[PDB]
């Protein structure tokens, strides 16, 4: 409170100093299940080139 | 469905010569790289000789190396084969087979699929 009134005497009353806000425990990243490949073991797989 | 039917062989004797003829229906022989097998008589099945699609990579059979040729008339749409200076251990039925995975994307072993009826040529006295 003296830090934020800028001033070394703070006299009788209720003050607003600052917010507080719950921080985030973890991280989420949600996509589709991976699904239509594309052909690769296809080509170095070739039997005949 | 596809046929590859055999025709020319049957008996001979031992020196003479004689052609084998292959004909296919139902497709287009002309880009099926083809290769014969031979059978003796009451045995197994034996390699013969090797055309490609190409034309340009042919691979024969150690014993008929050196004569024995094979072709292609893509005009009549068959595979011939010339036996020239039979001897007496040639006598077998004959094969005229063509090769499965004929594609460029394949990832699939080889396997002759179409097989052949099979004719059978003697040689003796």
């Known amino acids: 409170t003296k830090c934020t009134l800028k001033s070394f005497t703070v006299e009788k009353g209720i003050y607003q100093t600052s917010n507080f806000r719950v921080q985030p425990t973890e991280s989420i990243v949600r996509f589709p299940n991976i699904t239509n490949l594309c052909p690769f073991d296809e080509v170095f797989n070739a039997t005949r080139f | 469905q596809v046929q590859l039917v055999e025709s020319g062989g049957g008996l001979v004797k031992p020196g003479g010569s004689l052609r084998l003829s292959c004909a296919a229906s139902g497709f287009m022989i002309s880009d099926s790289y083809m290769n014969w097998i031979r059978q003796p008589p009451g045995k197994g099945l034996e390699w013969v000789s090797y055309?490609?699609?190409?034309?340009?990579?042919?691979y024969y059979g150690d014993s008929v190396k050196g004569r024995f040729t094979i072709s292609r008339d893509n005009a009549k749409n068959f595979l011939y084969l010339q036996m020239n200076s039979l001897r007496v251990e040639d006598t077998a039925v004959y094969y005229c087979?063509?090769?499965?995975?004929?594609?460029?994307?394949?990832?699939?072993?080889?396997?002759?699929?179409?097989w052949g009826q099979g004719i059978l040529v003697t040689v003796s006295s």
């Open positions: 087979a063509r090769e499965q995975p004929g594609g460029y994307y394949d990832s699939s072993g080889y396997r002759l699929d179409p």
């Open positions: 055309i490609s699609s190409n034309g340009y990579a042919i």
